């Protein structure tokens, strides 16, 4: 609080050990390396994943696949998140952003259904899922896919 008696957080400042500064620290004369060999030399260290001449794990396993050039990533809003608002007017790619639900939808905002609609709501989405399109027409409401 005041300057002349400020106390730190409660188990947050630990001081770092200087290694190789005396035989009575637990890191004496050799500072954690060992005695000789590859690791104990200065700057030595094997590349990660190198079994010593034996070919590594990522040469035996074969490769497969290719990604895409157009892999349209729908921002998957679940159906449970709609159970917060009211009046049932619309849901909208101009509104469903700015109620904080979705952000940076790549292309299309699909309604996957894993919650409960619980309201006679009216949507206007991009494209649908099969089971969740039953839930909107369950309690009553159209759209524009």
């Amino acid at each position: 609080m005041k300057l002349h008696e400020l106390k730190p957080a409660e188990g947050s400042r630990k001081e770092r050990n200087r290694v190789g500064r005396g035989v009575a620290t637990g890191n004496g004369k050799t500072s954690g390396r060992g005695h000789k060999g590859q690791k104990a030399r200065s700057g030595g260290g094997v590349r990660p994943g190198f079994e010593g001449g034996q070919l590594p794990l990522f040469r035996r396993l074969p490769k497969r696949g290719f990604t895409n050039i157009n892999r349209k990533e729908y921002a998957i809003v679940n159906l449970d998140q709609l159970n917060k608002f009211e009046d049932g007017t619309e849901v909208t790619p101009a509104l469903l952003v700015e109620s904080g639900v979705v952000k940076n939808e790549k292309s299309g905002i699909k309604i996957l259904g894993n919650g409960s609609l619980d309201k006679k709501l009216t949507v206007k989405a991009h494209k649908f899922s099969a089971s969740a399109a039953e839930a909107i027409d369950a309690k009553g409401g159209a759209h524009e896919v």
Binding site: M1, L3, L6, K7, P8, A9, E10, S12
Partner: protein, 205 residues
């Protein structure tokens, strides 16, 4: 929840406008990563040494090798000579990290609530004087009594209050949008105008 107002020697009408910013129990460990931040940010880290590379000379190999009977010494400017070369000097770097924007206000609403919730705060009404008179302000600090460390705050500017009180040891004159966190706990006594006091809750809460 009702701070009493004085004007220049006289009691007057006061306000209650201290609700959320003035009154939170002070979260101290939030402050310790804010008082440490600013004072490890004021200073320009500019300090270097020349390591084994950039010193002058050293292409010679002085002894040869086998035969002479000295060490296996390599150059003239290796570190263990009395010449230069320092293996682990200070690299010129920068000392600057940051807290998130919610923590960055929660320290500041905890700093001045350390003042109001226990031992010390005063709100005065505004005061103007055109000619810069230092003596006409050291007069004022001893009527409504404060100790040596004292902080005055104008609402956005002062052509005189920023330019008086700049000679006295222990006084800082800070515009209300320049409210940092070291001085507000370095001081012991907030004396603010009544025009900025309504603004600091309208800008921190």
């Amino acid at each position: 929840n009702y701070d009493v107002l004085k004007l220049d020697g006289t009691k007057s009408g006061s306000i209650e406008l201290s609700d959320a910013v003035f009154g939170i129990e002070p979260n101290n460990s939030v402050l310790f990563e804010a008082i440490n931040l600013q004072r490890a940010s004021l200073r320009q880290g500019t300090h270097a040494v020349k390591n084994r590379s950039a010193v002058s000379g050293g292409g010679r190999k002085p002894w040869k090798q086998k035969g002479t009977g000295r060490a296996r010494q390599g150059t003239i400017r290796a570190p263990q000579w009395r010449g230069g070369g320092i293996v682990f000097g200070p690299t010129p770097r920068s000392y600057a990290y940051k807290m998130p924007k919610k923590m960055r206000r929660l320290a500041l609403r905890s700093a001045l609530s350390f003042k109001a919730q226990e031992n010390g705060l005063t709100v005065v009404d505004a005061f103007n004087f055109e000619a810069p008179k230092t003596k006409e302000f050291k007069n004022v600090l001893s009527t409504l009594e404060q100790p040596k460390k004292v902080l005055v705050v104008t609402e956005n500017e002062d052509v005189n209050v920023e330019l008086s009180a700049r000679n006295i040891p222990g006084v800082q004159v800070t515009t209300a949008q320049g409210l940092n966190v070291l001085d507000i706990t370095n001081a012991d006594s907030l004396v603010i105008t009544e025009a900025a006091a309504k603004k600091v809750e309208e800008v921190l809460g």
